[PDB]
Design a protein around this nucleic acid. Structure first.
Lengths: 246, 52, 177, 185
RNA sequence: CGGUAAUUCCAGCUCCAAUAGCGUAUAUUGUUGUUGCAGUUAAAAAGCUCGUAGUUGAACUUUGGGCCCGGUUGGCCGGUCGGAUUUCCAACGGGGCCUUUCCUUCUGGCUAACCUUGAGUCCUUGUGGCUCUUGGCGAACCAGGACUUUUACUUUGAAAAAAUUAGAGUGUUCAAAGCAGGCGUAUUGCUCGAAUAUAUUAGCAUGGAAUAAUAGAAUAGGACGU
RNA sequence: UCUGGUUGAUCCUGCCAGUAGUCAUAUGCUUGUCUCAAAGAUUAAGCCAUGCAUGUCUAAGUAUAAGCAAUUUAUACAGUGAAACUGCGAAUGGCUCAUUAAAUCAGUUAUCGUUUAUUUGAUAGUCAUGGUAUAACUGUGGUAAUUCUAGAGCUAAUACAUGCUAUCUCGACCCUUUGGAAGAGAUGUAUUUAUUAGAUAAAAAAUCAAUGUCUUCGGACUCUUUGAUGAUUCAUAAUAACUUUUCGAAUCGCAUGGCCUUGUGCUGGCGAUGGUUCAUUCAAAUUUCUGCCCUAUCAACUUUCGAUGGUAGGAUAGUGGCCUACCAUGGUUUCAACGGGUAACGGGGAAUAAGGGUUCGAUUCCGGAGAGGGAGCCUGAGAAACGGCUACCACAUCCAAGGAAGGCAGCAGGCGCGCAAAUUACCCAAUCCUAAUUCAGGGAGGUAGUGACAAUAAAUAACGAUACAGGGCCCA
C-alpha cells in the first residue's frame, strides 16, 4: 500500500474479539486513540456484540448523536473508538458503569460498576520524564499524561487516578508480593501475586507470579500490571477472580 | 525466466534493453537459421573440395 | 532524479544485483547546494512530512563564535582558504561544512577593545591572547571553520580557529602553498 | 473475498470395489433395513471407521491420562446419548465392539418399524416421506434420524397428518366429494 | 415374399454394476534405499604405492558411604450418611546434611534460619506439639563493584495471527453445516457458552551434568598472603 | 504392495499375465428436488466498443442565484439552497503475480540512526478589529472538435497578505495577626551555532586566584539540589549571538445572564474551528540472527565505471560509498563463491503414507510487486500514483487536416480460430469505509441470474385381496 489502510478484514481481527466469520467480510477498523490496535475494542462491537442494545450502525450512530455514553466522563461520538483494558463506561439512561477488564477466557470482560468505583480509574505509569522548563511528568499505560507527580513513583507503577479531576489519587509501587494482573500473553487475566522478577540488563525481564492456588508462572513486565496488595485490590473483581481451572 | 521469449517484444522493448545490460554485466565474468548453418558448413566443404 | 539505494550496488559476494522493484519516492536524492559567496540567496524545500529545509545558494556574511570568549558576531566572509576534501572547492570558494576560511576581524577586535580597554596588535591575564591570533587581528582577517550545513540549514555558523587546529591547518596551508 | 464455509464428503468408497461377501452384506442389510444406497452404507461405515479409529487411539494412550479420560468420557456419553452403547457396556472394548447393525437399528425407519407403526420398513420409509409422524414435537421426513432414547419414546403420528391428527387427504376428500355428488344426483 | 394403417406380433427377450449421477480418453501403482538397495556370475570396485580437505578416531580424572527428612503409589485398611485421610511396610523417584567435597568475594542491607536462648506448655509413661526474643546464619537476593571455561546435547516456560487440523458442547427437523443458545412470573426476565490441543529450524529464559570436545601452572612470565 | 501361469510334486532366480489410484486434464450421456458453494490460466502481464466504478456540509468556513418559500420580529443578515470559492479525501478498496533464487517471505530483532496529517492526553500573560483580491455571476468572443478557452466588469472568506491590543521572588519597617509593607532583582517561544551544567568511592589539611551568609571584620563555613537508562554530549537547566524570523486566535454557531459609575460602560455560559511543544495512536522507513530449487561437461570471482576498508563533505527524514573527494587493497569461495536454468509471487496451508517422507500451494488471511512497457515529475502527512502529470517506443482514435486525445493484471461486456461457457441485472436494506459530516456515496460489498467446481439430505409408490398351476429353488 502507498499509505495506511482504512480497511479491516473479518479474519484480520484479533481472536479475542469473538466475532463471527459469516456476518461480515469486514471488521470495523478501530480509530486511533489511547490504546494500541490489538488490545482495544470498538464501541459498536462492544454494544452490539456484547450489550446487544443496538443491531446496526445507523442505530449506534444515532445513539452517539444522542450523546449518551461518557468514557471517563468524556463522551465520544466515534463508532470505532479504541476502548481498551481497564476502562470506565458510563450509562446515563440505564444508570450503570462498566469496567472493561480482561477475561479469564483471555477475552475482554464488562464489569458492572458503581458510581464510586467509576469516579476513579487505574493506570500503569509507563514512563516518567522531565519536560521543558524542567517540569516532571508521567505517561501512563492508557496514555494519560500527568504533570508533577509524587517523586517516589517510577515507571511501570500502578496509580489510582480520580477521573473527575483527572488527578493522581494515589499510587502503588512495584514490589514482590504485590497483587498483579497479567494483561497480555498466554496466561493473561490470571490474577496473581508476584513471586519475583528475573532481571536482564537490556533484556526482556521475566517475572515469576504465584496465585491463590499456589500456582506459579512467568510472564514479561509488559504483561505485568500490579493491582494492589495481598487481599487488597483497589477495584472490584469479577467472578472467578482471574483463576484458570480445568 | 530471466531471458524469456515474451509475447510482445515491441512492448517489452526497453525491458529488453535493460535485460541486455544485465546479461552483458553478469557475463562480463565469462567474456572479459540451422538450415543456413548447414548450408554454410557444406559450403565450406564444397569450397575445400574444390581447393583439393 | 537521484536516489541513494543499495540494491543497485554490488553484493558482498561481488555479485551484481537484479532490480527488485521500481524506485520509490521516499529514497530520493536532492541536488547539493553548492553554496558560494554572493548576495543573500536562500531557497526552501518541503521535505518529508512537510518539514521545511533551507538551501543556501549565495550568501555574503555569516555568524562566528569565539569559543574562548564564548561570544559570537556576524562577520563577513572573505573566501575559502582550505578544504580537507577538495582544493577545487577551495578554488571555487564553495561554502559547506568543515571548511577553513578567512573572515572579518574588526567587530571581534572592537569587542575586545571595548571589553578589555586594550587594543590588538602593536584583567591582563585574561587579556593575554595567542600570538597568531594577534597576527590575524593585525592583518584584519580571521581564520575560521565552517561547521554548519547551509546546504541543509541555510546556516553559515562557524567558529574561530584555536591553537592546536590552527597550528595543524597552518602546517597544512604552509605545505599546500 | 469471504470466509470459506467448511464442508465435507460424508463417506468414502471401499478398498476393493467388487467383493462377493461385502456385496451380500450390503444386499442383506439393504433389504433388511429398507435401504437404497451403497453411498449410505459408505456414510455409516465411514462413521464407524472414524469412531473406532479414535477409540483405538485412546486405547493406545495411557490409562489415567486426563486427555484419555476426557475423550473416553465424551465419546462414551455421546454413544449412550444416542443410544448405541449400552449402560453396562460403558468401556472402550465395547466401544470397539459397536457395529453398523446397531447404528442401523438406531436409525429412525428401523425404530418406527420396531414400533409397528408400519407393516414394513419400506412402508415406514413411505410414511416418513409422507411426513405423518413427528418426533417429540418436530415433524421429520428423514428416515435416518439416529434418534435418542427420549425421542424414541417420543415417536408419535403427526397432528397435521390425517392418520394421527388433521382432516383426511385429497384422495379421501375428493372421493367423498364425488360420492356425495353421485348420491345427490 | 406380400404389405406401411400394414402389423399387436424374442407383448416391447434374459442377466451383472452403479445411480441423480455415470462413462470415456491422456498422464502417475522396499524400483534411490537416514530409516531401508546392490557390487562371484543377468549392470556395477580403484595396475601398484603415497597423498590436501573432509569423515571417523585406545583408555583414565569426585567416586563411594552414611544420616535425616518428607512426598508417590500397592495393599491391611473405610471414620462417612459416593471418599476424607491416620498407623504400617515393599518399591518409585526427591530434598537437606556429614563423610578431605567453592559453596565468587567483600561492600551494607533483608538477615534465610536455628550452631541461637528466655520462659511455659494443649495431650496416649513423650525428641510424638509450638507463641513471642536480649551476642548471633553471608550468601535471603537486594544494589555496589570486580571476575568467573565455552559449548554440543536434553528437561521446562514464554512465543510461533486467524482460518485450516484434531477436539468439548449444542436435535441447523437430520446432516453437511453453524456457534449458537437455554431457561421466567411468555402480564414487560433468568442463565450458559462461544472450550482444549498441536504447531518442528533459529532466538530468549530455565534445570540437568551422562555423553563429546574445549582450556589450563614448564624458559613458571604461575597461584594464593600478614 | 501384491494375485495367476513351467513340475508327479516342492523352492528360489526368472518371464508373462493381471492390479491401483490421482478437488490431474479433457470428453460424453443424463439431470427433478433442499441447503450450501464456486465461477484462472495461449509460458497472450496479448488487445479492447460501450457503460459504470470518488467526491463530501453541519446551528456553526465563504450566499443579494435578478433561486424558491412568503412571511411575520427582523432595513445588513437570519429558512432552504444551484453554482462557485474554502476544507478534507481521492496514496484505501478491487485486479494480477509480469518481475524477482538470501532478493522477498517467515520467525527473531533493534533503531541511544528516522518522520508522522490524523486520534488521544497535556501544553502558551512576556483594535470598538488594515488591505489585496478573484471565482461563482453580468457582458463581448474564438474553433471542426475535447471536463478548451480569451478579453472585460463585479464580490467574498477560518482565502491571500498584514496587523498592536502584570507577575513573582526576596524583603528593612511596623504587630503580632486574618498580617501588610518602603526598597532590590527578574520575567515567551521557534531555528541555527559555540560554551557551561546535568554529581555522587571512603577521611581530614596547605596553597594561591575569586571574595558570599553572618561579619561576634578575627574569620567559621555551620544545612548544602539534580532524573533515568545496561550505557549516553540523554531528559532537563545556563550563557553569547543568529534568522530573506515561526507561533503566541483580527475566526464561528447557540443562547443570553450578572452588574453597576444608566454608559447603548463593565463582566458572564454552552460548543465550534484553528494553534506551539511534548506524549500517545496509527504508521512508515531503516536494522540483526536463521532458513531458499537445480546446475562443477559451471573454480575461481568483484574492483577504469565503488569492488573492500578509512577521512572529509554532500544528500537524506535520518545511519550508511548512498554519492563525491582524498586515502589504504581489499572482499567471497570446494562448508561451492560466481554465473546459468527455473510455464520460482513467499508463507500459513492442501494431498498422500503407518512412519520416514513426497508433491503442490495464481487463488477468501498476511507480506511484497505491478497496473502496454522505458525514463521523470507536481500536489499532498502519505504516490515515483498510473479510473495524476512530462517525454520515448508500441500501437491506436476523431475530423473541416489544422489539431485533438490514449492506458479494464477494477465492475459487467468484447476481440485475439473459422469452433463459441457468468449477468453490459438490482440495491447500498446489511458489514464496513469516505467526507463539512447521522442524512452524501460506495461494480468494496450484498441481492438474485447463469455448463451436474466441490458438498448435505432424499423421490419415482405403499398396501391388501382375488383368480390362475405344480411347479419353483441349490450346488456339481
Amino acid at each position: 500500500a502507498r499509505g495506511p489502510k482504512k480497511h479491516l478484514k473479518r479474519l484480520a481481527a484479533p481472536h479475542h474479539w469473538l466475532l463471527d466469520k459469516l456476518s461480515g467480510c469486514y471488521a470495523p477498523r478501530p480509530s486511533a486513540g489511547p490504546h494500541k490496535l490489538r488490545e482495544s475494542l470498538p464501541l459498536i462491537v462492544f454494544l452490539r456484540n456484547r450489550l446487544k442494545y443496538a443491531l446496526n450502525g445507523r442505530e449506534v450512530k444515532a445513539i452517539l448523536m444522542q450523546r449518551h455514553v461518557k468514557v471517563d466522563g468524556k463522551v465520544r461520538t466515534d463508532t470505532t473508538y479504541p476502548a481498551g483494558f481497564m476502562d470506565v463506561i458510563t450509562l446515563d439512561a440505564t444508570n450503570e458503569n462498566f469496567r472493561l477488564v480482561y477475561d479469564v477466557k483471555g477475552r475482554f470482560a464488562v464489569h458492572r460498576i458503581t458510581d464510586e468505583e467509576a469516579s476513579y480509574k487505574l493506570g500503569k505509569v509507563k514512563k516518567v520524564q522531565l519536560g521543558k522548563k524542567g517540569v516532571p511528568y508521567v505517561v501512563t499505560h492508557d496514555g494519560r499524561t500527568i504533570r508533577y507527580p509524587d517523586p517516589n513513583i517510577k515507571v511501570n507503577d500502578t496509580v489510582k487516578i480520580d477521573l473527575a479531576s483527572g488527578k493522581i489519587t494515589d499510587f502503588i509501587k512495584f514490589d514482590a508480593g504485590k497483587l498483579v494482573y497479567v494483561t497480555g500473553g498466554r496466561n493473561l487475566g490470571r490474577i496473581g501475586t508476584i513471586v519475583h522478577k528475573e532481571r536482564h540488563d537490556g533484556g526482556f525481564d521475566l517475572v515469576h507470579i504465584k496465585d491463590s492456588l499456589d500456582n506459579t508462572f512467568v510472564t514479561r513486565l509488559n504483561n505485568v500490571f500490579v493491582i494492589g496488595e495481598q487481599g487488597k485490590p483497589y477495584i472490584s473483581l469479577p467472578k472467578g477472580k482471574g483463576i484458570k481451572l480445568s | 525466466g530471466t531471458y524469456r521469449k515474451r509475447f510482445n517484444e515491441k512492448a517489452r522493448s526497453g525491458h529488453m534493453a535493460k535485460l541486455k545490460e544485465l546479461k552483458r554485466i553478469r557475463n562480463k565474468q565469462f567474456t572479459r537459421s540451422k538450415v543456413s548453418r548447414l548450408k554454410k558448413k557444406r559450403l565450406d566443404k564444397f569450397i575445400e573440395h574444390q581447393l583439393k | 532524479g537521484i536516489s541513494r539505494d543499495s540494491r543497485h550496488k554490488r553484493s558482498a559476494t561481488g555479485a551484481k544485483r537484479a532490480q527488485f522493484r521500481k524506485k520509490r519516492k521516499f529514497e530520493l536524492g536532492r541536488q547539493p547546494a553548492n553554496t558560494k559567496i554572493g548576495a543573500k540567496r536562500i531557497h526552501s524545500v518541503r521535505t518529508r512530512g512537510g518539514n521545511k529545509k533551507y538551501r543556501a545558494l549565495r550568501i555574503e556574511t555569516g555568524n562566528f563564535s569565539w569559543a574562548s570568549e564564548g561570544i559570537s558576531k556576524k562577520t563577513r566572509i572573505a573566501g575559502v582558504v582550505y578544504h580537507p576534501s577538495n582544493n577545487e572547492l577551495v578554488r571555487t570558494n564553495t561554502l559547506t561544512k568543515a571548511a577553513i576560511v578567512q573572515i572579518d576581524a574588526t567587530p571581534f577586535r572592537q569587542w575586545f577593545e571595548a571589553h578589555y580597554g586594550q587594543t590588538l596588535g602593536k584583567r591582563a591575564a585574561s587579556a593575554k591572547i595567542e600570538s597568531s591570533v594577534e597576527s590575524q587581528f593585525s592583518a584584519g582577517r580571521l581564520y575560521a571553520c565552517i561547521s554548519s550545513r547551509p546546504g541543509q540549514s541555510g546556516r553559515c555558523d562557524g567558529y574561530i580557529l584555536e591553537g592546536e587546529e590552527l597550528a595543524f591547518y597552518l602546517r597544512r596551508l604552509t605545505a599546500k602553498k | 473475498p469471504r470466509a470459506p464455509r467448511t464442508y465435507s464428503k460424508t463417506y468414502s468408497t471401499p478398498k476393493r470395489p467388487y467383493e462377493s461377501s461385502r456385496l451380500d452384506a450390503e444386499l442383506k442389510l439393504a433389504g433388511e433395513f429398507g435401504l437404497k444406497n451403497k453411498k449410505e452404507i459408505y456414510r455409516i461405515s465411514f462413521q464407524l471407521s472414524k469412531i473406532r479409529r479414535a477409540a483405538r487411539d485412546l486405547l493406545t494412550r495411557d490409562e489415567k491420562d486426563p486427555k484419555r479420560l476426557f475423550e473416553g468420557n465424551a465419546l462414551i456419553r455421546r454413544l449412550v446419548r444416542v443410544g448405541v452403547l449400552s449402560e453396562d457396556k460403558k468401556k472402550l472394548d465395547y466401544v470397539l465392539a459397536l457395529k453398523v447393525e446397531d447404528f442401523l437399528e438406531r436409525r429412525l425407519q428401523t425404530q418406527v418399524y420396531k414400533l409397528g407403526l408400519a407393516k414394513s420398513v419400506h412402508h415406514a420409509r413411505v410414511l416418513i416421506t409422507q411426513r405423518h409422524i413427528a418426533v417429540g414435537k418436530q415433524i421429520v421426513n428423514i428416515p435416518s434420524f439416529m434418534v435418542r432414547l427420549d425421542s424414541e419414546k417420543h415417536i408419535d403420528f403427526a397432528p397435521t397428518s390425517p392418520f394421527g391428527g388433521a382432516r383426511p387427504g385429497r384422495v379421501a376428500r375428493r372421493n367423498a366429494a364425488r360420492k356425495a355428488e353421485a348420491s345427490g344426483e
